[PDB]
Amino acid sequence: NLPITGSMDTAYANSTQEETFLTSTLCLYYPTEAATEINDNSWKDTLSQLFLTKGWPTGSVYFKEYTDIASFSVDPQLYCDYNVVLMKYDATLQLDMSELADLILNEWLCNPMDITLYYYQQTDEANKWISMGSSCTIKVCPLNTQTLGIGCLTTDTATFEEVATAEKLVITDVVDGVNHKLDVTTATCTIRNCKKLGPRENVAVIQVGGSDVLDITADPTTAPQTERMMRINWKKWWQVFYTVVDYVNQIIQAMSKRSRSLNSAAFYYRI
Amino acid sequence: NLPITGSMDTAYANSTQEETFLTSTLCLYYPTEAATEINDNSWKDTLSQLFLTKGWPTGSVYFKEYTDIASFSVDPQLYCDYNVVLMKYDATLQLDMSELADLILNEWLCNPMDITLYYYQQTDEANKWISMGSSCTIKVCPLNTQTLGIGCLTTDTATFEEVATAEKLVITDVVDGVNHKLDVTTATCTIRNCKKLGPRENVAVIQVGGSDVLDITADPTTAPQTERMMRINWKKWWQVFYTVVDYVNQIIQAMSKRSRSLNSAAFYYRI
Amino acid sequence: MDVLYSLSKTLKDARDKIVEGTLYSNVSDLIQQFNQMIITMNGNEFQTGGIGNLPIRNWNFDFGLLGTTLLNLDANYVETARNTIDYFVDFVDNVCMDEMVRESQRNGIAPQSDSLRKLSGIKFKRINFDNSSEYIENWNLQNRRQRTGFTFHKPNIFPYSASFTLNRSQPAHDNLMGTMWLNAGSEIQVAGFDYSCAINAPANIQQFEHIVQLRRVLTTATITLLPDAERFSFPRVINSADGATTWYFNPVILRPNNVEVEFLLNGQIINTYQARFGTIIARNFDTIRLSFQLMRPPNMTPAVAALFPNAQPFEHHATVGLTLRIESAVCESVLADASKTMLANVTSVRQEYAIPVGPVFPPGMNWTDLITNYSPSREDNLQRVFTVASIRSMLV
Amino acid sequence: MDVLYSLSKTLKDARDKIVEGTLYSNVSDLIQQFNQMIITMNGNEFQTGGIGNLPIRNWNFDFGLLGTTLLNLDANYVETARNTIDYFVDFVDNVCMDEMVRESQRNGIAPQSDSLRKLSGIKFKRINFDNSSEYIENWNLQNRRQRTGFTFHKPNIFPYSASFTLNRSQPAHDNLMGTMWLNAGSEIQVAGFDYSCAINAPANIQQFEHIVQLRRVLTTATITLLPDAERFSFPRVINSADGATTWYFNPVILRPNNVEVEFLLNGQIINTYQARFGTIIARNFDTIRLSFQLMRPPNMTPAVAALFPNAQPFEHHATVGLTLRIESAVCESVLADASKTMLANVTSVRQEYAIPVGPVFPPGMNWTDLITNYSPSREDNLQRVFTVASIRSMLV
Ligand SMILES: *[C@@H]1O[C@H](CO)[C@@H](O)[C@H](O)[C@H]1NC(C)=O
Ligand SMILES: *[C@@H]1O[C@H](CO)[C@@H](O)[C@H](O)[C@H]1NC(C)=O
Ligand SMILES: [Ca+2]
Ligand SMILES: [Ca+2]
Ligand SMILES: [Ca+2]
Ligand SMILES: [Ca+2]
Ligand SMILES: [Ca+2]
Ligand SMILES: [Ca+2]
Ligand SMILES: [Ca+2]
Ligand SMILES: [Ca+2]
Ligand SMILES: [Zn+2]
Ligand SMILES: [Zn+2]
Ligand SMILES: [Zn+2]
């Protein structure tokens, strides 16, 4: 990172939309019920040809399927340069979907949390505990300077306070500056101490149906809808995919290249 | 592609090896027999830890396994920024080793061929026909200027001249300027008309045991033996992997980034 | 130059003072000077023009002297004087125009037109009399190698530059820290912006700096410093430094903190004002250093607290601005300013006669290019042409 | 300057001609000039300044005239003359040194030291006599705005620059096409290299171009042009343009083909030479355009064909050179050259007395920096100091 000096009289360059469409890849994540309703084995080819009409080279649009929001929330691996997640809306899962967005619309720096030997705390409002697995049931016992527990006994987990049960993904936020003993099913869950660095610009979430319920910020005073959080009413999935294809330029305009240099181990679908 | 003007007094920068390892990744391709002899369920983990001692961050080194040279030759996909292929030497598979090395050490620009409709010819010395699949059998019938076979009958394919039998990968080089009718088992193998653009500088091949027998150029008058074609003597595979880990600095020094802009969206690892 | 100025001054005084009914006592010395000018110029042939579309004109001087025995001037005397005055004024105007359109690199201070070079001969020094105008006075001081001084109201010392620097940037341009400025003429507006409102800053303070180098030393400068930059206080879409994309700026203005304006000469702090606004005096300087701070308000009302959240997205971007206007200054070099017209006169003469671009000045006499690269040769030529323009303005 | 030169010339002539036993007829005019100098200088106080570590020195002149009335000069005459000449020579050397260490951005052709400014008064013009040296002759021509000419053996016209241009390149730096050059003093060595040896070129020909834009116009220049550039004909490891890495150069030298040396003035072809080597004459130019070609040999013996395969790797890289030496030339401006000592003298005087860096010349009188930015102000100051240096070298 170096200072960048620019002249306000500089001329705008031509549109780079065609070049980025040519040199980038698009990943679409949709629920399995979409494929079920569409009921066509060649719909991937059809959408690829339509995207080609929109400018994307054949083979650069990758279609990925997930069973549901809860299943997809277990270590979501976003591959392409541009990722669009068609997330079905369920009034009962408002938190979970929000968490999923909170997981994929932001960059997270995470380190392992070996709870069974160590005591942990959250240093600042950017710190959270992200737990992912088949079943994440997390109980918390706040502690104090004398190392005793408040309304909890370290020797009896039954007295721990319940913050998660049977979760595929959950973001736990506790009071900062306080040590907590943790009890999570390590067999079916992995908990990580994470810091949200900032927005993840290459991931857009399109909520299919419902209303604006997403809250990607733990602060109760903010519920910001960024340009990467779209929301479309629906009755047929074919119309949903047609509107995704037709307004692909608008969707990618709302997104930007990831720009982060990572330390992780994930594959990517790039050109 | 613009001219670059440089001064012969510009100060050398510091070593980029540390940041290169922290920002790049290493795919190591080994045969199945290597894992069989190692006889450990966690040799990947210890090799990754040793690589970390050598500088690479955890999860950056990828370990891919192939049954043998023939099977690996069937459309090999190279994922990491730096690819090292440990190829065992067999005195009876020199041409197959050479063809694999040619395919993965050079950059190729390929287009499909329709052998059942049109006749084909090779324009210049860089033009070849690469056929790969489960079983490639290619027979050729050179035609004269009256589109009539020479020493072959266009109607009868039994008179055709056999250039490949049951191969999994074969690079066919015929006389340039002559139209050839091709009889290829398209049901089990695909043939593509390709041009050699240049070297793939991100792929190194380490020949385990044997002699210098590789020939990555069809010209009889050249056997280059470039700096990306190493050879070692061995008795045990653990020694081979320890040598690869210890001298990974030299291996990566012998390689450079791919530098080619691709029109194809494939699966890669990139940190 | 002094002889040309003296011709112009004699002609102007003749126009002003040789009027019907005036006592000869009021013009006796002027009439003597005028007759001396006639005597000196008589029998001399001059040629002006021949550059661009400026026409070649030949000038011959064979004139009679003015009478000296009148008690009061009458109509006949005034018309007799006016014929000669008209011819001489035309000659002086053409000589000035011929000199204004020419330039030289090595010796641009010296006369370039053949007419003015001929007028620089010794015999013409008899024409020379009172050199009282500011520009001719500075010309004579320069020729004597004395300290020169030009007073400028709103000196045009800053070349036009609307620019920005991003000290913190991302490809999406949503968390931007930096500063944007306009330098134009005698005016400097600067504005440091933080999109996060310095929430993650060490002491919740973001330090902004702006250094402006003046191409010439300014002395005895009166400046007005104001705590807001109205130019960068409204929302705007701004090109990226490479022009590849455009980013959004949505200012919300907070008062600048620890404002410190330093006026430096050769890297030495001459003047320093902290938290001082209104009229200040910079006595001698060539560089201006404006250092200010964005301090996050420790206490916020619910609306203000709503403006600035803990983390992104940042929709309202904190901005602190400074305005610095040089109202008057003194410079040892010639500059275009708001009150004078020499630059306008030279540019007008060069444009009207389609003077080809020379090796000294930028095409079209563009001031931004001239002041950006204000070399000593350009200063010589500019002083020469500005002095000639001032001489011409006495008559035309 | 002409008075200072005349003092130095009179003193040098006195030292060379006032010798024991010489006929007075050999020195009569010299004795008259010397006595005129003594009369003009008597009663005048001079001070050579204290710039840097140059000591403040005071000079008083009260000398008797050199005698007449001798048929042959004797020892007494020569001894008296030697005393006077020694004092005068010390004064002249100190004045020259004081002038050599000073500079002004504007009016840098004018005298800078107080002693030389005093000597520029009318009362010392009597000292002025024969101005025959090349530098004083050109000084007088410049003062009159006449054509100036300085003859240089091996003129130092090219600032040092060892650079390269990669027209075809890639991160591995194994298949490179481009040019590398050294421009230093009066010499240009250029070399166009192709790693593929023009295997894939349109006609197995690779075109190489090198344009060197001289910062002053050279006239009547004799230039040796040789085919090979020995400086770029051996294996090298060269930094990358940005310094990130190093690439390898393994030249094999082929003769340049279709050599084309153009000497251009103001973008107009003045001289052209095709397939010409040895001495060539460029009569008037400010730019040199060298066009050469690497032609792949149509026929190659097995050893040659082994070096140039159809495809990569390319281990022997085909290079075509060109050497261009300006043996002598004429320039209207002053330049450092191989035969003269003016630059060395000025630099030595500045370094010996620890003269602080001024606003005109680069620190240390660095010639590369000087001629890279050879501005009119720099040209005036440099001509002044070089003329003073030559005047001093007449005596010191
Ligand atoms: C940009 O678009 C214009 C408008 O057609 C075209 O002329 C130009 O070549 C394009 N490219 C650039 C680099 O300006
Ligand atoms: C490079 O290395 C040198 C010495 O090893 C060190 O002083 C310097 O800080 C390093 N980094 C850079 C950017 O030069
Ligand atoms: Ca959940
Ligand atoms: Ca409890
Ligand atoms: Ca917390
Ligand atoms: Ca919230
Ligand atoms: Ca084979
Ligand atoms: Ca046959
Ligand atoms: Ca062939
Ligand atoms: Ca070969
Ligand atoms: Zn930007
Ligand atoms: Zn010599
Ligand atoms: Zn390079």
Coordinates of C-alpha atoms and ligand atoms in Angstrom, one line a residue, chain D residues 166 173 240-241 247, ligand 13:
Chain D
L166 CA 12.9 -4.7 -24.1
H173 CA 13.6 -13.5 -19.7
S240 CA 15.4 -6.0 -14.6
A241 CA 13.8 -2.7 -15.5
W247 CA 18.1 -11.7 -16.6
Ligands
ZN13 ZN 13.1 -7.4 -17.6

